[PDB]
Design a protein around this ligand. Structure first.
Ligand SMILES: *[C@@H]1O[C@H](CO)[C@@H](O[C@@H]2O[C@H](CO)[C@@H](O)[C@H](O)[C@H]2NC(C)=O)[C@H](O)[C@H]1NC(C)=O
Ligand SMILES: *[C@@H]1O[C@H](CO)[C@@H](O[C@@H]2O[C@H](CO)[C@@H](O)[C@H](O)[C@H]2NC(C)=O)[C@H](O)[C@H]1NC(C)=O
Ligand SMILES: *[C@@H]1O[C@H](CO)[C@@H](O[C@@H]2O[C@H](CO)[C@@H](O)[C@H](O)[C@H]2NC(C)=O)[C@H](O)[C@H]1NC(C)=O
Ligand SMILES: *[C@@H]1O[C@H](CO)[C@@H](O[C@@H]2O[C@H](CO)[C@@H](O)[C@H](O)[C@H]2NC(C)=O)[C@H](O)[C@H]1NC(C)=O
Ligand SMILES: *[C@@H]1O[C@H](CO)[C@@H](O[C@@H]2O[C@H](CO)[C@@H](O)[C@H](O)[C@H]2NC(C)=O)[C@H](O)[C@H]1NC(C)=O
Ligand SMILES: *[C@@H]1O[C@H](CO)[C@@H](O)[C@H](O)[C@H]1NC(C)=O
Ligand SMILES: *[C@@H]1O[C@H](CO)[C@@H](O)[C@H](O)[C@H]1NC(C)=O
Ligand SMILES: *[C@@H]1O[C@H](CO)[C@@H](O)[C@H](O)[C@H]1NC(C)=O
Ligand SMILES: *[C@@H]1O[C@H](CO)[C@@H](O)[C@H](O)[C@H]1NC(C)=O
Ligand SMILES: *[C@@H]1O[C@H](CO)[C@@H](O)[C@H](O)[C@H]1NC(C)=O
Ligand SMILES: *[C@@H]1O[C@H](CO)[C@@H](O)[C@H](O)[C@H]1NC(C)=O
Ligand SMILES: *[C@@H]1O[C@H](CO)[C@@H](O)[C@H](O)[C@H]1NC(C)=O
Ligand SMILES: *[C@@H]1O[C@H](CO)[C@@H](O)[C@H](O)[C@H]1NC(C)=O
Ligand SMILES: *[C@@H]1O[C@H](CO)[C@@H](O)[C@H](O)[C@H]1NC(C)=O
Ligand SMILES: *[C@@H]1O[C@H](CO)[C@@H](O)[C@H](O)[C@H]1NC(C)=O
Ligand SMILES: *[C@@H]1O[C@H](CO)[C@@H](O)[C@H](O)[C@H]1NC(C)=O
Ligand SMILES: *[C@@H]1O[C@H](CO)[C@@H](O)[C@H](O)[C@H]1NC(C)=O
Ligand SMILES: *[C@@H]1O[C@H](CO)[C@@H](O)[C@H](O)[C@H]1NC(C)=O
Ligand SMILES: *[C@@H]1O[C@H](CO)[C@@H](O)[C@H](O)[C@H]1NC(C)=O
Lengths: 49, 138, 445, 502, 149, 49
């Protein structure tokens, strides 16, 4: 996807690879080369008036 | 009846008639008072005297004309029966609730007979005649 | 011997973190309060997958074996905890089920007060293991309480496992496709679950996606009376249809004067046609050939002729060309089958067989009047742009494949509308009444 | 499935709607071919009803109020324990003590405060429908151009809904020309508004507005409302401070000050109770009001389920947006719901056929959402038009429309703001302690038939009095209390008595 | 600027009809949006596939229009029911409902017709030039409390 | 930031009243929409031309 990757406080279990939101959108990931957890945000959008 | 169903109302017609009876018995025996607290009894010819002050006619006008006013009312309720007994088309508002719902369900059921561009309007024809890879497209 | 499974045997269905949320999932699960068999070993079926558990703090129970045979003839899983490691291979092992103390190979891998629990399943060609270990206070039945199992292993091996056995107290139950509602806490663990099919309250919890429900009345489901039996009603004909009189007719007609045979009052078997190696093409339009034996028809008409192999493509709805435009046409909504074969082994003659000739839907016309191709009123005289309407196919045994003779048969089906007269080989049942049944009247299911 | 709440019991009863009980255990249920609906051939009892076959509930010949409604006059409840089923009762029976000369007159009253909650506005929303349908994929966005104006009139529709929510809010609260503010002193004749007036320690909401705000609890974008919650609270503060210091006069012109005990004496004349009844009972009336406002604080402290209308607007907006987002995961018959799978697995000529299924399903899913939002906004607008009418007729006036501004004869009402809506505290006079009396339509004196100018004739059994109709207060009958029309003979039920001439 | 409610009724219906006409130019996935191109270029079995895309799109286009017109008609009916109530209460009577027939104490009102609507000229009494006074709830004379009638 | 109106402290006290000594007759205009433009669409002619 496209997004802003960020550091996070989320407590994944050792076998868990990525996290999902209430509506099943992916919103966190484990980095496979150093096993810390990143929090994912959409890149900003909105109407222009 | 193809997965269509009609659910009953919660209040049956004899329960609706018990409510209109209670409203009407409260109104006749107690005036407006049962709407603002507990019902307070008042004589009906004396309740009508207050209804006359409410329209700006002095209440002596009722008592001086009570038998005339009572006859004009009793005769007017006679004309309601003759009107409804003659003229069922007075209830056209209620009868259109029935007709609109019947037209809507008949159209929903008739649309099962349509092909929409498939081999048949009947789902069991397609499943009898065509093997799975071909049937899914229909 | 059997035991109640209680709320045992739930596992993390996917490798996804979720928190403070209720997730509805469908998977192969052990149903709540099912009967789990108990043992103190036999070969057992694997079915859709297994929940396995034991009372263990000793390694008296060393491991498991799995496969079709679980022995010699083909690849089979051996899994052993040898106290140094978990040891795995999928070899064609011939060794007996007693390697333990008295107390090819296409893949390989290496890695009481207590109960040890496992799930084994085999999906998408991969073999999966999940596990848990816990203290307990009863050996003689499974602990009533909740604890989710987490994955260990996920092998690419593709083996069609159908049986397994234990290697030397233990419990076995089978997974089934069910919907569960799983409670994830703030820290990513499953902490509770609802088996939705267990009872109407569990249906209500799963309908609301909630572990508590308020006072009220909730629609959870729909009800139907189900069919008690299956009824088949067909005409009582036993006469077989004379298809040999069509497909093995001595002389086939010309394409300009195509011949029609009516087929009637008989039991057909289209497998006798469709199984045959005799046909170079076999195509059906409003019906699939695999379904024909289930159907029944008011009439069947066989139309047949010989034609040039390259032109056989014109014998379909929506086509155009000389044979389609002047000799024979199917309607563009045609319901039926077209069959043909290369007939150079019979139809050809060394001078080119002069008997075979070409010039609305289901028309036929044998008129001999000259083509007046020119402006001339040709008045029965041939010449430049004045030609006899028929031309002959040059069918000789030396012809190249597109120029060879092919024999053609087209079967046209009159569907059930009036009472039918040509049926597939379906055996009629007795008739049942007032009960709900599945039924089939002449193909009307 | 009928449930007492899992808070209360795990027992249930099951209703098979329109089915006959002779079919039920011979079906998908119990002792026949059974897809998933596992066995309970009886749950404890089986009982046929006009609504359907009812399983696991106990039939009862009593008739309680309807706890859980089953249909066709049947209800269910949890009682001495088991689930029971019964024919519901409509209310307590009452034969009114009518006769042609008996009247009941109330000798005392209660001031009553009742709370009415009304929705006023939805959450505002807008969707970049190209970014919803196509996720910023270029191959999809080129196919979406073939559909023309659809993903443009969707935004025109949602823009009309969004602008209307700010109109709905302005029609209700902006009914005041000037921001009126309360005096420093609070000498309102012993009435105590401190729990509904603004709190300088607080936004600067009242104590009750703080309860109300506590109890209610992509390509898609959510827009801010035009008026902030602090602006909404300055309008409810101005409406309330005008109402307390000036009566109805701030609605008809410039606010004219009046003492609050004299404003309430006018509210008493408005319901037909003689104004000395307030000044003679002022401390009692003030205590009944102060006590009644205290019960509102307790009622709003006890449960959130009082505000179920406002919590429904919150819940419906969330449910609709969750469904619109979940529908991105659906196939609609396509090879995958992930748009980048289709573009990477297939050549263009196959990919365009598979992508147009996702475009078709997502475009249909978004048109379904916008249609449902247009229908829901029309319901919220009808509620905002009612709340705007209750502001003018109940808050800025004194309504004489029966049951419009709560039950009993209306005195006044006060607005408090709440999330997505408004709350009216309707204050009303309820008569409370009636006595029976004998009555007559007229009195005959020197042949003249006398009628009361205002009020009714009554007797305690030995003496005749004239009294006001809504509060028992007897006066001796005099030529200033009555008027004459004609002689005794015309009037049915006239009685002989003295009339005094002062 | 005052009659913007009645001018919006005209504009809403004009945009709806122009949107409905403009959608005839859309392909919906056909080779052309002009039906005679399909019928002249493609023979029948090929042509039906393309025409069914235009049928599906033009039918969805028209269902979208009629559904938005049904919702817009219900909105105008609520306004016509209010205008009918305003005529009975304000024009045929004198309404005591606060701010129903304009601001101030209502005296009377007059109907004037306007295209697609109605206009009420509401006549109201507005009080003016207030003065402050000392006031009392009651008066004591011979030991007895007097109140104004 | 928008202004909600002029701020005003009403001159309230337990014994002061204000009474209007004059009036103005006011005429106010209220506009209401009552009907749409009546339409019919022949869907065979719109869809198939
Ligand atoms: C009846 O006669 C007409 C000629 O009068 C036949 O017309 C031909 O039909 C085929 C159908 O594929 C066309 O390709 C030819 O071009 C037609 N010929 C002409 C000169 O137009 C017709 O086939 C006959 N119908 C039947 C039922 O026999
Ligand atoms: C009218 O009703 C009120 C209660 O609503 C009565 O007031 C109570 O009177 C008793 C003594 O009789 C006291 O113990 C209570 O504390 C009073 N309550 C309040 C709120 O003051 C009042 O007495 C009744 N008046 C008549 C004439 O019956
Ligand atoms: C108006 O009523 C409120 C209560 O609703 C009074 O406030 C309470 O006053 C007592 C005694 O001073 C305190 O113990 C409480 O803590 C107060 N409660 C709150 C929430 O503030 C208030 O004093 C009354 N006002 C007047 C002028 O009497
Ligand atoms: C009806 O009302 C009258 C007036 O209030 C009552 O007459 C008074 O009765 C008391 C004793 O109860 C005497 O002390 C007074 O002197 C009487 N006054 C007059 C003017 O007669 C009468 O008692 C009441 N009747 C009933 C049945 O209660
Ligand atoms: C009211 O008082 C009058 C007298 O002032 C009563 O009239 C008498 O009625 C009786 C019975 O009908 C007659 O025999 C007398 O001749 C009447 N007397 C006079 C002087 O006319 C009248 O009946 C009383 N009304 C009631 C309701 O008791
Ligand atoms: C990956 O390799 C680097 C060294 O190349 C090492 O520092 C890092 O810890 C490794 N991470 C994992 C998850 O193995
Ligand atoms: C099967 O399981 C149920 C509990 O769900 C139990 O009551 C029953 O006795 C078991 N039956 C056998 C044969 O073990
Ligand atoms: C366990 O297995 C490994 C090979 O997988 C072997 O080297 C080791 O010696 C074994 N240990 C025991 C105790 O048998
Ligand atoms: C090994 O695999 C081949 C087929 O790949 C098979 O013919 C042979 O019998 C197998 N041998 C053993 C010992 O499994
Ligand atoms: C599993 O069985 C299928 C036939 O159903 C076969 O094609 C496949 O090769 C088998 N795979 C293994 C590894 O046994
Ligand atoms: C969640 O994890 C934290 C440490 O990250 C721990 O302190 C806390 O007790 C855990 N809570 C639960 C409910 O497991
Ligand atoms: C045609 O004859 C051959 C034997 O010459 C036979 O096998 C075949 O079944 C016959 N065709 C049909 C349709 O029975
Ligand atoms: C059950 O619900 C009622 C309100 O419906 C509540 O008063 C009661 O405390 C609840 N019971 C429990 C165990 O919380
Ligand atoms: C229910 O079904 C039976 C037949 O199984 C029938 O006799 C009975 O009258 C039916 N009762 C109702 C109320 O439908
Ligand atoms: C309840 O009513 C039925 C008739 O409707 C009667 O047969 C039965 O005896 C009654 N039972 C009780 C306990 O009242
Ligand atoms: C009035 O009196 C009758 C008896 O004469 C009694 O039944 C009724 O309950 C009384 N009503 C009131 C309101 O006191
Ligand atoms: C009042 O009612 C009673 C009983 O109905 C009747 O005897 C009496 O004549 C009536 N009196 C009047 C004045 O109507
Ligand atoms: C009334 O008196 C107060 C001071 O007591 C003053 O502020 C206010 O402006 C006066 N109003 C009028 C209308 O004179
Ligand atoms: C009342 O107002 C009018 C203007 O509306 C003015 O001409 C007139 O003099 C005023 N009268 C008094 C007594 O103030």
């Amino acid at each position: 996807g496209t997004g802003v990757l960020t550091e996070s406080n989320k407590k994944f279990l050792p076998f868990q690879q990525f996290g999902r939101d209430i509506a099943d959108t992916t919103d966190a990931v484990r980095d496979p080369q150093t096993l810390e957890i990143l929090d994912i945000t959409p890149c900003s959008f909105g109407g222009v008036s | 009846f193809n997965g269509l169903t009609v659910l009953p109302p919660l209040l049956t017609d004899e329960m609706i008639a018990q409510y209109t009876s209670a409203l009407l018995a409260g109104t006749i025996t107690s005036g407006w008072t049962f709407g603002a607290g507990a019902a307070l009894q008042i004589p009906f010819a004396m309740q009508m005297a207050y209804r006359f002050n409410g329209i700006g006619v002095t209440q002596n006008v009722l008592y001086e004309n009570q038998k005339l006013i009572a006859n004009q009312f009793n005769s007017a309720i006679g004309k309601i029966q003759d009107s409804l007994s003659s003229t069922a088309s007075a209830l056209g508002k209620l009868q259109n609730v029935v007709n609109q719902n019947a037209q809507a369900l008949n159209t929903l059921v008739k649309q099962l007979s349509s092909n929409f561009g498939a081999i048949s309007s009947v789902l069991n024809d397609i499943l009898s005649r065509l093997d799975k890879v071909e049937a899914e497209v229909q | 011997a059997y035991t109640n499974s209680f709320t045992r045997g739930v596992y993390y269905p996917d490798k996804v973190f979720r928190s403070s949320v209720l997730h509805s999932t469908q998977d192969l699960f052990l149903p709540f309060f099912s009967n789990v068999t108990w043992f103190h070993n036999p070969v057992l079926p694997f079915n859709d997958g297994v929940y396995f558990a034991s009372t263990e703090k000793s390694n008296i129970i060393r491991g498991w074996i799995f496969g079709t045979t679980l022995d010699s003839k083909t690849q089979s899983l051996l899994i052993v905890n040898n106290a140094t490691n978990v040891v795995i291979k999928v070899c064609e092992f011939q060794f007996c089920n007693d390697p333990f103390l008295d107390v090819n190979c296409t893949f390989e891998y290496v890695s009481f007060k207590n109960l040890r629990e496992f799930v084994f399943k085999n999906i998408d060609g991969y073999f999966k293991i999940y596990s848990k270990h816990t203290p307990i206070n009863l050996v003689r039945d499974l602990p009533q309480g909740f604890s989710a199992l987490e994955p260990l292993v996920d092998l690419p091996i593709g083996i069609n496992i159908t049986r397994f056995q234990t290697l030397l107290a233990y419990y076995v139950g089978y997974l089934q496709p069910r919907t569960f509602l799983l409670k994830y806490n703030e820290n990513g663990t499953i902490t509770d679950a609802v088996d939705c099919a267990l009872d109407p309250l569990s249906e209500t919890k799963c309908t609301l996606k909630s572990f508590t429900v308020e006072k009220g009345i909730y629609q959870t489901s729909n009800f139907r009376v189900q069919p008690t039996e299956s009824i088949v009603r067909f005409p009582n004909i036993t006469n077989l249809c004379p298809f040999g009189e069509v497909f093995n007719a001595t002389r086939f007609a010309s394409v300009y004067a195509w011949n029609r045979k009516r087929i009637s009052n008989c039991v057909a078997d289209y497998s006798v046609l469709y199984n045959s190696a005799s046909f170079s093409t076999f195509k059906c339009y409003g019906v699939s050939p695999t379904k024909l034996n289930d159907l029944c028809f008011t009439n069947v008409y066989a139309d047949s002729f010989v034609i040039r192999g390259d032109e056989v493509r014109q014998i379909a709805p929506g086509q155009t060309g000389k044979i389609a435009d002047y000799n024979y046409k199917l309607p563009d909504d045609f319901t039926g089958c077209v069959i043909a074969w290369n007939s150079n082994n019979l139809d050809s003659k060394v001078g080119g067989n002069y008997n075979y000739r070409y010039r609305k839907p289901f028309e036929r016309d044998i008129s001999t009047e000259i083509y007046q191709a020119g402006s001339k009123p040709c008045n029965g005289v041939e010449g430049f742009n004045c030609y006899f309407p028929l031309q002959s196919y040059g069918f000789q045994p030396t012809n190249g494949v597109g120029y060879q003779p092919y024999r053609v048969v087209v079967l046209s089906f009159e569907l059930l509308h009036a009472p039918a007269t040509v049926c597939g080989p379906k055996k009629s049942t007795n008739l049942v009444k007032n009960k709900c049944v599945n039924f089939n009247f002449n193909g009307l299911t | 499935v009928i449930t007492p709440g899992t808070n209360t019991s795990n027992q249930v009863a099951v209703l098979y709607q329109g089915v006959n009980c002779t079919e039920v255990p011979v079906a998908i249920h119990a002792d026949q071919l059974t897809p998933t609906w596992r066995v309970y051939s009886t749950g404890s009892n089986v009982f046929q009803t006009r609504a359907g076959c009812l399983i696991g509930a106990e039939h009862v010949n009593n008739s309680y109020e309807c706890d859980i409604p089953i249909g066709a006059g049947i209800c269910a409840s949890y009682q001495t324990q088991s689930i029971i089923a019964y024919t519901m009762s409509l209310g307590a029976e009452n034969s009114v003590a009518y006769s042609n000369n008996s009247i009941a007159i109330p000798t005392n009253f209660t001031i009553s405060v009742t709370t009415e909650i009304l929705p006023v506005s939805m959450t505002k929303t807008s969707v970049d429908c190209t970014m919803y349908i196509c996720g910023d994929s270029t191959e999809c966005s080129n196919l979406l151009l073939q559909y023309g104006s659809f993903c443009t009139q969707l935004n025109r529709a949602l823009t009309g809904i969004a602008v209307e929510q700010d109109k709905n809010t302005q029609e209700v609260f902006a009914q005041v020309k000037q921001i009126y503010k309360t005096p420093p002193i609070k000498d309102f004749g012993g009435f105590n508004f401190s729990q509904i007036l603004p709190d300088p320690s607080k936004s600067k909401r009242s104590f009750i507005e703080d309860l109300l705000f506590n109890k209610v609890t992509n390509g898609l974008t959510v827009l801010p409302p035009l008026l902030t919650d602090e602006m909404i609270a300055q309008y409810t503060s101005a409406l309330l401070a005008g109402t307390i210091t000036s009566g109805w006069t701030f609605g008809a012109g410039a606010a004219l000050q009046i003492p609050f005990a004299m404003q309430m004496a006018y509210r008493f004349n408005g319901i037909g109770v003689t104004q000395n009844v307030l000044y003679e009972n002022q401390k009692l009336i003030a205590n009944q009001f102060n006590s009644a406002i205290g019960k509102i604080q307790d009622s709003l402290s006890s449960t959130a389920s009082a505000l179920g209308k406002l919590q429904n607007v919150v819940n419906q907006n969330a449910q609709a947006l969750n469904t619109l987002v979940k529908q991105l995961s659906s196939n609609f018959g396509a090879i995958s719901s992930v748009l980048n799978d289709i573009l990477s697995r297939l050549d263009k000529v196959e990919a365009e056929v598979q992508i147009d299924r996702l475009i078709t399903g997502r475009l249909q899913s978004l048109q379904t959402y916008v249609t449902q939002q247009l229908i829901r906004a029309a319901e919220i607008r009808a509620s905002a038009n009612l709340a705007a009418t209750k502001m003018s007729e109940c808050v800025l006036g004194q309504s004489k429309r029966v049951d419009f501004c709560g039950k009993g004869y209306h005195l006044m009402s006060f607005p408090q703001s709440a999330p997505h809506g408004v709350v009216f505290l309707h204050v009303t006079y309820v008569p409370a302690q009636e006595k029976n009396f004998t009555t007559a339509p007229a009195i005959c004196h020197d042949g003249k038939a006398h009628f009361p100018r205002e009020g009714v004739f009554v007797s305690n059994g030995t003496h005749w009095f004239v009294t006001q109709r809504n509060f028992y207060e007897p006066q001796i009958i005099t030529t200033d209390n009555t008027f004459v029309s004609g002689n005794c003979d015309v009037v049915i039920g006239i009685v002989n008595n003295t009339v005094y001439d002062p």
